[PDB]
Amino acid sequence: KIEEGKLVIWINGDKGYNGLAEVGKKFEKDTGIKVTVEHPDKLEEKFPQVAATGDGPDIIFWAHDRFGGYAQSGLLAEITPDKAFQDKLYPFTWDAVRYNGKLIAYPIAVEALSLIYNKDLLPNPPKTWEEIPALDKELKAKGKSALMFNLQEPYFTWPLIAADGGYAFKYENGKYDIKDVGVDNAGAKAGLTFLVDLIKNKHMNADTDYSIAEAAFNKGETAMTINGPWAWSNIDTSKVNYGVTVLPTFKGQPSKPFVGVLSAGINAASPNKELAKEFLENYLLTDEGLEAVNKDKPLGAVALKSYEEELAKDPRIAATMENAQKGEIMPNIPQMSAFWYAVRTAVINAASGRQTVDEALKDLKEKRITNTEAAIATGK
Ligand SMILES: OC[C@H]1O[C@H](O[C@H]2[C@H](O)[C@@H](O)[C@@H](O)O[C@@H]2CO)[C@H](O)[C@@H](O)[C@@H]1O
């Protein structure tokens, strides 16, 4: 059961949960309502189990891609922003939180992976994926490593799979065709094949993860990483002189990172729907509230127009938007959960040699996405 006269907010560990707590304490001062911010693990999996029963947090933060499945499960209170509120945010960020004609969450910020590089180790970063092997060989002679990024989560490898023609679900009227999967087409095979080639030649490791890759770049042992704006705060701390820049091309085609819209939904079983609406519209989506959060750990290109005009000055945010333009907004449909689960098995297996690239993502299309779609939609 959720307590009336209180807000509990859930956001991911990698985001600025402490800045958001400052917006919490400001809210507390004005209204008397205590705001408790939490960053539990496997947040996106924990919210559905907990909220369906009883009852979870009042407000949930995640990128938009998971919110269709949440609305479809009945978990999100349909929001009620008026026209004046809407026009303070960029039209395409509203689109990412629209589902069956209705808005279901407030959009916060636009997240896109970029190439992050060490200027001292690598003044002039490589423009292409094809240049990386040779660079790694040149850096292995001096004890260091060319590129180290998270290979456990498909969000990070996707830019390379999509680069040459791969895609999740086709767009369409539309409308996304869940029968038309672009995950065993030639562009994906080519992107994943290239990735597994880097791993066969000892240029990357299969079992590199978010922690390991961050530690590596931040302690000056890698020339390059691939991360989002949330990670800039800790590179700042490490003192590594770094730059954020366009993702490398593959066969001359831009890397196409899936673009996420950090979003806030109101739990459907919360008795504090108004307090939540007040919190999000009047405290968070202000220059001042988005400042507090952005200063803990940056959001990227925020959805609020007035504050974005101050942030577009940052070269590192111009690079984030450069990369987002080259990419595609993520679908928000419910079958994204299924899609993500399956793709994560395929890539891990392909990357570890358990299967070949052609086997891994032939199984994916032919059975795993549909099997997982059916498993998610059946109860377990
Ligand atoms: O890797 C699958 C995962 O990708 C995305 O998650 C991102 C998220 O958008 C970022 O904001 C940050 O939290 O890193 C995550 C990668 O672990 C999808 O948004 C998410 O649904 C999916 O599980």
Joined tokens for residue 355: 């299967």
Distance from the alpha carbon of residue 111 to the mean position of ligand 1, in angstroms: 10
- Determine contact, residues 286/198, Cβ cutoff 8 Å: no
Expressed in angstroms and rounded, the spacing between residue 101 Cα and the centre of ligand 1 is 24
Residue keyed to tokens 């180790």:
121
Are the C-beta atoms of 239 and 310 separated by less than 8 Å?
Answer: no
Question: Measured between alpha carbons, how far is 40 from 324 in angstroms, rounded to an integer?
Answer: 28
40 pairs with which residues across the strands?
A: none
**Listed resolution, Å:** 2.7
Strand-pair partners of 265: 60
Contact yes or no for 244/251 (Cβ under 8 A): no
Positive or negative, the Cα torsion across 140, 145, 147, 149? positive
Residues with CB under 6 A from ligand 1: 12, 14, 44, 63, 65-66, 111, 153-155, 260, 340
Query: Distances from the Cα of 3 to the Cαs of 27, 29, 33, 35, 59, in angstroms?
Result: 17, 19, 11, 11, 13
Task: Give a three-class secondary structure readout of 64-108.
Answer: HHHHHHHHHHCCECCCCCCHHHHCCECHHHHHHCEECCEECCEEE
- Return the closest-CA partner of residue 231 out of 179, 169, 299: 299
Domains of the chain: 6-111+259-329 (3.40.190.10), 114-256+335-378 (3.40.190.10)
Which residues, at least 6 apart from 124, have a Cβ–Cβ distance to it below 8 Å? none
CA angle 191, 347, 128 (to 5 degrees): 30
Around Cβ 119, how many Cβ atoms within 10 Å? Answer: 13
Comparing CA positions, the residue from 227, 322, 328, 262 lying closest to residue 63 is: 262
Contacts of residue 244, defined as CB under 8 A and 6 or more positions apart, other chains included, come to 114, 115, 116, 232, 315, 316, 319, 320
Q: Are 301 and 285 in contact (CB under 8 A)?
A: no
Q: How far is the CA of 31 from the centre of ligand 1 (A)?
A: 33
Residues in Cβ contact with 115 at an 8 Å cutoff, skipping those fewer than 6 apart? 125, 224, 225, 226, 244, 245, 246, 247, 248
Residues 6+ apart with CB under 8 A from 179: none
Q: Which atom of ligand 1 is nearest to the CA of 336?
A: 21
Cβ-contact 2, 270 below 8 angstroms: yes
Mutate to test the pocket of ligand 1, among 11, 17, 44, 155 (most ligand atoms within 8 A of CB): 155
d(CA 131, CA 120) in angstroms, rounded, equals 19
Helix (H) or strand (E) holding 109: strand 106-111
Strand order in the sheet with 145-147: 145-147, 222-227, 114-118, 242-245
Tokens of 24: 């919490």
First to last CA, the chain: 24
Q: Is residue 129 a contact partner of residue 248, using CB atoms and an 8 Å limit?
A: yes
Give the method used.
Answer: X-ray
Q: Which amino acid is at 238?
A: S
Q: How far apart are CA 304 and CA 324, in angstroms?
A: 17
Contacts of 99 (CB under 8 A, 6+ apart): 67, 68, 71, 332
